[model samples]
Target: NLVQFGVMIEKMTGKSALQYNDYGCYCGIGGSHWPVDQTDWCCHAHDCCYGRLEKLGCEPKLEKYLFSVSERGIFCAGRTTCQRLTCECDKRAALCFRRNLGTYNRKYAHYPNKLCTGPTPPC
Candidate 1:
């Protein structure tokens, strides 16, 4: 799922492809492909892709690339819902997840006990 989304981001933003994993080039790297509630659970008990979400948009260095996205959008929503939030699919799920988390997401309001981030493909 993350792989596909990452590809989407690259295609849209013309950024370098992501090689997200739990080891090797990702040795010091660890991130959660999805969001988790900090107040209760601990998916972070072990290795996770923490800041993978911060790589939003084309790399600042690669802003020269032409990325097309039209419509409402969200980014890096650690534990938010993009249902009512419509937007283009810059394939920026990584960025969306990194930028869109927290606050009053519908899923949060609908299911507070369950604050897991779900798939957020660019609309």
Candidate 2:
């Protein structure tokens, strides 16, 4: 739903924040039926354009990620004010996290993996 909404915005505006962030998640999701940057008059889709994709013939797609020291440590220290949506201080942090939901150390805790707040630069 949100992905389509994002795509819709890009279609009307010619640009959008729904771009790539993690290659790992990027790989699993496959591709979208629509262009990442659509024109003022365009259309289409049945798969995820942002993150990993696939399903049992079509279900809500989601991905996972991990948060380590280097991954998000510097961005989330003190100045602590986090939310699921894009926050004023952190800008794109929350959106970035939600954009990727692929799995990472799901049932274990040998490492520090938490939701982060900050820019998830290209990786």
Candidate 3:
């Protein structure tokens, strides 16, 4: 997935592109379970770690972010590429249209009202 995203971005932007993965998608390369320098290891998984933990029943553990968006997101997972958006996403995910399955754990969106609703939620 990142190979394709990276190749396209590189060609289109004419700048070095980043290849990243979140959670444990590909051997947990830059996942929350592993730690590498941000620049040295650029395959960032913006918002995918929560479901990974929940699937492993590692819920209520040390929380990590998956994806973020500058336009106000992070409602789909723990973190994202947009921190500014995450802050604005406060208290309004249910009313907001941006949603995701966070499927690494449940395989589909289950309860609809369970989106994280705090500065951060444990599990």
Candidate 4:
């Protein structure tokens, strides 16, 4: 159901799925660089946005809405204030990812040494 919500978000926004790994790269495993390029940076910013909600104690409420079902369907009705904010964040970040798609590398989706750290080479 959670994954379905992510899929819904993707379809509505015309953005990639909200893929993230807190300990590494935005969408997948990190290699030498934290944010290999602008695409990764978009995910980083999105993480920060969600982090702020966590700090504000809104994450739980947000999650509830994300998985909640209305008379119509899952999150198909009116959105809570928190939901609106989160959707806005995702929309903006997704656009950023789209804009920086050229810098994205499939390699970044592969696992690298957990200890690896450095700047990414130019794509």
lDDT of 3 by residue, 32-120 (tens): 32322322112222333434434545432233333333355223344432322332222122121112212123221121223312232
lDDT for model 4 comes to: 0.52
Candidate 4, residue 87: lDDT: 56
User: What is the TM-score of candidate 2?
Assistant: 0.17
Residue 6 lDDT in candidate 3: 36
- Between candidates 1 and 3, name the one with more favorable TM-score: 1
- State TM-scores per candidate: 0.21, 0.17, 0.20, 0.59
lDDT of 4 by residue, 22-107 (tens): 32355432234566557667766766777676676666224533433334533432266666556555655555665665665655
Best by TM-score: 4
Better of 2 and 4 by TM-score: 4
**Best lDDT among the predictions, by candidate number:** 4
**Where does model 3 exceed 4 Å of error?**
1-4, 12-34, 40-42, 47-123
The list of candidate 4 runs beyond 4 A from truth reads 1-5, 8-24, 28-33, 60-78, 113-123
Of candidate 3, the 10-residue stretch with the lowest lDDT total is 94-103
State the lDDT at 62 in candidate 3: 38
Candidate 3 lands at a TM-score of 0.20
